[PDB]
Amino acid sequence: QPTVLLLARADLSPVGTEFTTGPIDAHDPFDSGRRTAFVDEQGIAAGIVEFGTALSVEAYPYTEMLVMHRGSVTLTSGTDSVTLSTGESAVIGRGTQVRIDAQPESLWAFCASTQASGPDKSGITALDRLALLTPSSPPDPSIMISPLPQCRSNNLFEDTASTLRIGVWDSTPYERISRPHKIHELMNLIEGRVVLSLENGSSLTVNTGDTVFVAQGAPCKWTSTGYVRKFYAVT
Ligand SMILES: [Cl-]
């Protein structure tokens, strides 16, 4: 029953979303800290991680994107080091030798590809909120209510171990009809706000600094009345 799931609010207010605590599978380096909101049969998972110590992983088992909501994490792999504070994001490629060093009481949203579908692209990739973007495809004209927007993106990470493309996107305002989502999508809003109207006839307002996950097949209407900029992970 694919749906739209609010993973975390900017102010860490309660979300309606149910999370399953524990490792996603027998390879997950996280367990008590892993809070999974969604996993599909083909291995895409989304949720949050609560963690407050360091752990080292010899070969990271997933391709995994982290979006910080509280605290701080420093990711180290050999001579590479990336520190993420609230609002910052990075990707751990599949196979990366990585140390994940969280300050106490840290919390991040995640999207992981837990199934490999091609060769590892290992390493850590930081994702700049202010990345420079180039024109990207608006929605299908046939589903539009408003005029077509101008959209831009930058695929800062293009996996070869999955179909994940991860980056930054922006758009002028638009409105379209409800459609089942064509792909899996994590979004974290850098600027603006969007209203997602849902299969059950309810509404989710995604505000600046919130992270939401839209499962493939989830019926979703998009309405934005202003500019939106987001981090994304899409399959
Ligand atoms: Cl854990």
Q: For 126, which DSSP code?
A: E
- Reported resolution, Å: 1.3
Given the structure tokens 């083909």, which residue do they identify?
42
In the chain, residues under CATH classification 2.60.120.10 are: 1-15+131-235, 16-130
> How far, in Å, CA of 26 to CA of 31, rounded?
10
**Residue 8 Cα to ligand 1 middle (Å):** 18
Give the number of C-alpha atoms closer than 13 A to the C-alpha of residue 187, restricted to the C-beta side: 27
Distance 231 CA to ligand 1 centre (A): 25
Q: At a CB cut-off of 8 Å and minimum separation 6, what does 13 contact? A: none
Q: Please count the CA atoms within 13 angstroms of the CA of 206 that sit on its side-chain side.
A: 30
- Distance (Å) from CA 50 to ligand 1 centroid: 7
CA distance 27 to 39: 15
Tell me phi and psi for residue 141, to 5 degrees.
-55, -30
Residue 109 Cα to ligand 1 middle (Å): 14
Contact predicate 60/92, CB 8 Å: yes
Q: Which two tokens stand for residue 214?
A: 């839209």
Closest CA to 64 of 48, 52, 78, 79: 48
- Could you tell me the CA-to-CA distances from 222 to 2, 37, 78, 225 in Å, in that order? 16, 21, 42, 10
8 A C-beta contact, residue 30 and residue 23: yes
In CATH terms, the fold of domain 1-15+131-235 is Jelly Rolls (2.60.120)
- Gap from CA of 116 to ligand 1 centroid (Å): 22
Method: X-ray
DSSP designation for 164 = -
User: How far, in Å, from the CA of 133 to the mean position of ligand 1?
Assistant: 35
> Do 155 and 163 meet the contact criterion of CB atoms below 8 Å apart?
no
Mode of pairing for the β-strands spanning 98-102 and 54-57: antiparallel
CATH number for the 16-130 domain, one of 2.60.120.10, 3.30.70.1450, 3.30.360.10, 3.10.20.90?
A: 2.60.120.10
Q: Residue 214 Cα, ligand 1 centroid: separation in angstroms?
A: 24
